[PDB]
Paper text:
When DNA damage occurs, PARP1 can sense and attach to DNA chain breaks in milliseconds, which in turn activates its ADP-ribosyl transferase activity for modification of itself or other factors, including histones. A previously uncharacterized protein, C4orf27, was demonstrated to be a cofactor of PARP1. The hetero-dimer binding interface was confirmed through extensive mutagenesis, combined with ITC and ADP-ribosylation assays. It has been well established that HPF1 binding to PARP1 restricts hyper-automodification of PARP123,26. Remarkably, our functional analysis of the structure shows that HPF1 and PARP1 form a composite active site, with HPF1 contributing key active-site residues.
To answer these questions, we determined the crystal structures of mouse and human HPF1, and human HPF1/PARP1 complex at 1.71 Å, 1.57 Å, and 1.98 Å resolution, respectively. We also determined structures of human and mouse HPF1 alone, and observed that the conformation does not change upon binding to PARP1. Notably, analysis of the surface electrostatic potential showed that positively and negatively charged areas are evenly distributed on the surface of HPF1, except for part of helices α9/α10 and the linker loop connecting helices α6 and α7, where the protein surface is predominantly negatively charged. Many solvent-exposed acidic amino acid residues are located in this region, including Asp235, Glu240, Glu243, Asp245, Glu273, Asp283, Glu284, Asp286, and Glu292, while Arg239 is the only basic residue in this region. Notably, Arg239 and most of the acidic residues are conserved in HPF1 orthologs from different species. Long loop regions are often difficult to resolve in crystal structures due to their intrinsic flexibility, but in HPF1, the loop connecting helices α6/α7 is ordered and well resolved. As is shown in Fig. 4b, the C-terminal half of this long loop is stabilized by two groups of interactions: one is the salt-bridge network including Arg239-Asp286 and Arg239-Glu284, which also acts to position the catalytically important Glu284 side-chain; the other is the hydrophobic interaction between Tyr238 phenyl and Val218 side-chain, as well as hydrogen bonding between Tyr238 hydroxyl and Glu292 carboxyl.
Author numbering: 35 to 92, 100 to 176, 178 to 345
Write the structure that this text describes.
């Protein structure tokens, strides 16, 4: 329990039981280097809060293995090839609740968060099954052995292995908007529909607006191209005054997701405030620190 406290106090996030059970699974695979037990067969390595379990931390965990498009909800636990910057993370709607599922993102490809089961056994199972369906006879036998052991453990522990579980499908009903990442945003909406209001542009049209800002040819033209964004920020101010905090979280998230440093200032105006109004204060802290140092490479706080 002491080790658990260390892991969870460093991130100020509770970790679900599958996190700890999966460490033990990887310890059975390789007692000497559990974090690397899937490296040879799958190209995956356990990191993040697993670095603490591994003793590699013996310093801001808010930025540790936080890739360029990882929103504060997303906490990296597994990394793959740095050519695509494939990685898996727990996704939490609230810092005070357990992860709602495991998402994957390829940070050199896009900002999309792909849901991959609701626990890390599922996410690794799905990765393995895809790899098995692609490939080398020598690799297959090894993969099939890991698949058997992984599947047996999940069955003993009661963990679903589906990419989209019934639980995940129920969360879809509470998502108020997908955002650019596609993971979805969940905020309280009361019986009077207070809590969220939509943006006045479609996602497609918002991306066009962002494109014209990024491609502006001068400061003068960029200022003019920013007018639709400033207009939406005024709407967000009234939404905040009126307790529809989800609007500013959506606009700020989309601008973060678009990826341009030209949006860092307004994203820093939208997202900390939105998270603080939503009483998700840790996420306000993460996004502030990430916007201040949004690195594309060298995000390992222990290197």
């Amino acid at each position: 329990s002491d080790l658990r406290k260390e892991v969870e106090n460093h991130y100020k996030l509770s970790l679900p039981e599958d996190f700890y059970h999966f460490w033990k699974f990887c310890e059975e695979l390789d007692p000497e280097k559990p974090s690397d037990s899937l490296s040879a067969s799958l190209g995956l390595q356990l990191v993040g809060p697993y670095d603490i379990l591994a003793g590699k931390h013996k310093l801001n965990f808010n930025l540790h293995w936080r890739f360029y498009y990882d929103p504060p909800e997303f906490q990296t636990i597994i990394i793959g090839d740095n050519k695509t910057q494939y990685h898996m993370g727990y996704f939490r709607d609230s810092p005070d609740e357990f992860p709602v599922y495991v998402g994957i993102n390829e940070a050199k490809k896009n900002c999309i968060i792909v849901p991959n089961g609701d626990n890390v056994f599922a996410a690794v199972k799905l990765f393995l099954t895809k790899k098995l369906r692609e490939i080398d006879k020598k690799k297959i036998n090894l993969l099939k052995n890991i698949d058997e052991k992984l599947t047996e453990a999940a069955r003993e522990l009661g963990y679903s292995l589906e990419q989209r579980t019934v639980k995940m499908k129920q969360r879809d009903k509470k998502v108020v908007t997908k955002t650019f990442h596609g993971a979805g945003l969940v905020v309280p909406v009361d019986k009077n529909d207070v809590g969220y209001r939509e943006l006045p542009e479609t996602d497609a049209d918002l991306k066009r607006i962002c494109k014209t800002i990024v491609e502006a040819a001068s400061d003068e033209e960029r200022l003019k191209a920013f007018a639709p964004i400033q207009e939406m920020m005024t709407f967000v101010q009234f939404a905040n005054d009126e307790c529809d905090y989800g609007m500013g979280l959506e606009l700020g998230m989309d601008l973060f997701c678009y990826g341009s440093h030209y949006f860092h200032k307004v994203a820093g105006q939208l997202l900390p405030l939105a998270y603080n109004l939503l009483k998700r204060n840790l996420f306000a802290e993460i996004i502030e620190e990430h916007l201040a140092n949004r690195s594309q490479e060298n995000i390992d706080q222990l290197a």
